[PDB]
């Protein structure tokens, strides 16, 4: 299944770069041995080459990830950004994407990858739930996301 724990959610401040977000969101996954040590660096490498900016409304979303061979156990870490930060567009668009919600994926199983992308697609199209992600605290977000993830593994 997919490991999603309380310190896999965190709010991030106003002055963080794309690389800071990656490293922060990956820190607890490394610490828990969910991923290899240089996992953040491969996510940055993969992002520089295959961007994951989703310009959905009302809140921009990003799905940074790397290769499944760098994963030891399935996990997801979630980031809420104080200010919007720009990601390059996933559909090859030249315009950057403002993003306030980040789903870092550390999935080694193809069936989880597709189940999780499908779920994220339904989630960012829920205008209500997106607006909650911008006001809930970490314990609320962790409680809400956790029960939803559990609905995928079954």
């Amino acid at each position, epitope marked *: 299944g997919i490991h999603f724990r309380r310190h896999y959610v965190r709010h991030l401040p106003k002055e963080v770069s794309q690389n800071d977000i990656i490293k922060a969101l990956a820190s607890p996954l490394i610490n828990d041995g969910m991923v290899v040590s240089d996992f953040a660096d491969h996510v940055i490498t993969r992002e520089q080459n295959f961007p994951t900016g*989703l310009p959905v409304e009302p809140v921009g979303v990003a*799905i940074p990830h790397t290769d*499944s*061979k760098y*994963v030891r156990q399935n996990a997801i870490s979630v980031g809420i950004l104080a200010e919007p930060v720009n990601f390059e567009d*996933a559909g090859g668009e030249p315009d950057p994407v403002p993003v306030r919600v980040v789903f870092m994926l550390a*999935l*080694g*199983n*193809w*069936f989880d*990858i*597709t*189940n999780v*992308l*499908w779920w994220i*697609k339904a989630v960012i199209q829920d205008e209500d739930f997106m607006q909650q992600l911008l006001v809930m605290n970490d314990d609320e977000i962790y409680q809400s996301i956790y029960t939803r993830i559990s609905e995928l593994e079954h």
Partner: antibody, heavy 131, light 108 residues
Framework: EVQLVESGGGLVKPGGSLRLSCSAS????????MTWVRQPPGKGLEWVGR??????????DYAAPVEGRFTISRLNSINFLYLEMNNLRMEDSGLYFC??????????????????????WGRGTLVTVSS | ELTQETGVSVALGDTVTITCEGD??????ASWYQKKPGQAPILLFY???NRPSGVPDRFSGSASGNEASLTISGAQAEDDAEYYC????????????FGGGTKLTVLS
């Protein structure tokens, strides 16, 4: 260069058994999904089954007419893929291909579990089932 | 589960479309293979718009409803061959399946 080399094909009587081998080189075999495909005489390509990778625990899916009689497995330390075939029937005769299998999923329009495609193929080994 | 036309003919230099039909194509993309007798299949196209590099640009794939298509723009004599589609046998399935194959005759 990618190379896939099948072996083990031959003549076998109805009801007997045969083990096909596929030697792989030139790519990350340990992490590759691998598929067996067969072509009956004068007929089309038929998907036989597919073994997944480490993240999936090397699980296998099989075509219905072959389920329970065929086993696919791998030995990653020597870069070999195997197909074991029991209670063979005349309609199992044909040319059996080894194929390195990619995975595809389009975020906005895809549906789980996406799609598998066959990006490198061997030349085949011939299986003749005949009394 | 995937149906193709048995055979099509094209004149040298023309454009031809080969199609593949099945319920699962409403949810999944098709991949496309060329095969000639005594030779390994070759992947021509997969997904929404993926042509593996090394495949000539005159090959292109598309999708609409329960059908997938391979288009060859400017058929060459090399293109005389059998063409196979492949996808999920059913929506959401872990299995795969091929169509029966279309024999393309290029009158050269």
């Amino acid at each position: 260069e990618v190379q896939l080399v099948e072996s083990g094909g031959g003549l076998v009587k109805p009801g007997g058994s045969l083990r096909l081998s596929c030697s792989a080189s030139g790519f990350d075999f340990d992490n590759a999904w691998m598929t067996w495909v067969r072509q009956p005489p004068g007929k089309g390509l038929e998907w036989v089954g597919r073994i997944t990778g480490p993240g999936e625990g090397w699980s296998v899916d099989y075509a219905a007419p072959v389920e329970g009689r065929f086993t696919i497995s791998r030995l990653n330390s020597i870069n070999f893929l195997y197909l074991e075939m029991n209670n063979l029937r005349m309609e199992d005769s044909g040319l059996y291909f080894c194929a390195r299998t990619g995975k595809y999923y389009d975020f906005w329009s895809g549906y789980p579990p996406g799609e598998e495609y066959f990006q490198d193929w061997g030349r085949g080994t011939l299986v003749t089932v005949s009394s | 589960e995937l149906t193709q036309e048995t055979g099509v003919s094209v004149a040298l230099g023309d454009t031809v479309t080969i199609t593949c039909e099945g319920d699962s194509l409403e949810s999944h993309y098709a991949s496309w293979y060329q095969k000639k007798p005594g030779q390994a299949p070759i992947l021509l196209f997969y997904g929404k718009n993926n042509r593996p590099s090394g495949v000539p640009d005159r090959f292109s794939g598309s999708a609409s409803g329960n059908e997938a298509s391979l288009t060859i723009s400017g058929a060459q004599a090399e293109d005389d061959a059998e063409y196979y589609c492949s996808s999920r046998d059913k929506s959401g399935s872990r299995l795969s399946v091929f169509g029966g194959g279309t024999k393309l005759t290029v009158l050269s």
